[PDB]
């Protein structure tokens, strides 16, 4: 299997520097150009630069938008791709992707990483408060029951939420975070048969990488 995995994203202040890495496997790394592409939240993809393959001396090119400020490199022993960013500004806040590029024959980006989120801001890292969402003395018995978790007051993005360590997958909605007085809040709902809860356990697993927060919140009745 081909694998590309970005790492290194997180919070940085304006004017700072930050280096992203992209670990690859499942293909002959040296045969391929590699590109970095970024995407501000809810905006379009922007190509940033590439580094060529061994046949082309591993030379680099950049978009005018970052040339002279961003530098791309590669570790050909370990098949890792790098992106060094300097003098960062708000406009640089985005999800950064690495992508496999040209091989000398095909014109395509065959594979993309999952992306790493960079946030440029002066605000401080704040861990989330995670609160269970259980029905009050409501109808409850409707063949189904909807539970949730409120993930409140964190910074920066992102957070991850799963249910029953991913075991509950269908019937889950996670609502996009909203920014308020410098803090994000989101919620997640999960829907299951009420014969199964609270007969069986339902727990939301929340992680906030910026603060290395890991939370398991069991949803308890009453």
């Amino acid at each position: 299997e081909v694998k590309l995995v970005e790492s290194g994203g997180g919070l940085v202040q304006s004017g700072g520097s930050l280096r992203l890495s992209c670990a690859t496997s499942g293909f002959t790394f040296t045969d391929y150009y590699m590109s970095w592409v970024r995407q501000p939240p809810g905006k379009a993809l922007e190509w940033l630069g590439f580094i060529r393959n061994k046949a082309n001396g591993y030379t680099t090119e950049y978009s005018p938008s970052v040339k002279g400020r961003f530098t791309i490199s590669r570790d050909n022993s370990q098949s890792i791709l790098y992106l060094q960013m300097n003098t960062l500004r708000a406009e640089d806040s985005a999800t950064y992707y690495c992508a496999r590029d040209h091989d000398g024959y095909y014109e395509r980006f065959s594979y993309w990483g999952q992306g790493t989120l960079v946030t440029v801001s002066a605000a401080k890292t704040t861990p989330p408060s995670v609160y269970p969402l259980a029905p009050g003395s409501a109808a409850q018995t409707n063949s189904m029951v909807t539970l949730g978790c409120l993930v409140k007051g964190y910074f920066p993005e992102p957070v991850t939420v799963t249910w029953n360590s991913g075991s509950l997958s269908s019937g889950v909605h996670t609502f996009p975070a909203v920014l308020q007085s410098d803090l994000y809040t989101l919620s997640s709902s999960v829907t299951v048969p009420s014969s199964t809860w609270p007969s069986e356990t339902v727990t939301c697993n929340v992680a906030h990488p910026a603060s290395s927060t890991k939370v398991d919140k069991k949803i308890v009745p009453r």
Binding site: A44, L45, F50, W112, S129, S137, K152, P176, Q180
Partner: protein
């Protein structure tokens, strides 16, 4: 100097129907040496990375369904989707690689489906939140269509608008519905001055609002 532009910015299509979208380059992408157009299409589903669909304008990548077809040449390209499926919900980007690389601005494809009423659930503040002085009340409005919806919060029968935040999900990849969360935040002191908390949803699927409520005395 290769400007890429796409059209439309967005549209919606019902399942089973055809989708047509356009991509223009400020200069020809046809490479004279290889006689191919250096133009690729990518699909970015909600919450996912982009995925290669078509390259060399018309070559369909292995593992990509036949209903996706790229066409065009020179400065003008088209991606056609026949028999659209719910899962095709995505933003579609075109990208030139004739001179370095440049992406178009994307086309957002929404799926049209039959109107559906929301399923509404209300949740009182947890004891763990109240302990620290705050009180959030949450309402889920799940699996409805179309996206437009109104939520009102009433406390002891009176509407309250301040301290309310709303968030819609992206359309669902399987049932083409939306969901939305409405969260009302109060201080503990103010939460404890009132008894009834109500979230009312008005959606075009009924002239009757769907009302969910809880009373603090009953907690």
């Amino acid at each position: 100097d290769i400007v890429m532009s796409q059209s439309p910015s967005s549209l919606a299509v019902s399942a089973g129907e055809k989708v047509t979208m356009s991509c223009k380059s400020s200069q020809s992408l046809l490479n004279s040496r290889t006689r191919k157009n250096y133009l690729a299409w990518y699909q970015q589903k909600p919450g996912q990375s982009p995925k290669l669909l078509i390259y060399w304008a018309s070559t369909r990548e292995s593992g990509v369904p036949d209903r996706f077809t790229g066409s065009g040449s020179g400065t003008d390209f088209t991606l056609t989707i026949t028999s659209v499926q719910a899962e095709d919900l995505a933003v579609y980007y075109c990208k030139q690689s004739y001179n370095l690389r440049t992406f178009g601005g994307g086309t957002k494809l929404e799926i049209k489906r039959a109107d559906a009423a929301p399923t509404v659930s209300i949740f009182p503040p947890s004891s763990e939140q109240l302990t620290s002085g705050g009180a959030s009340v949450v309402c889920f409005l799940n699996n409805f269509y179309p996206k437009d919806i109104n939520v009102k919060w009433k406390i002891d029968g009176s509407e309250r608008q301040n301290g309310v935040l709303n968030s819609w999900t992206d359309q669902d990849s399987k049932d083409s519905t939306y969901s939305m969360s409405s969260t009302l935040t109060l201080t503990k002191d103010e939460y404890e001055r009132h008894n009834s908390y109500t979230c009312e949803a008005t959606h075009k699927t009924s002239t009757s609002p769907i009302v969910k409520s809880f009373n603090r005395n009953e907690c």
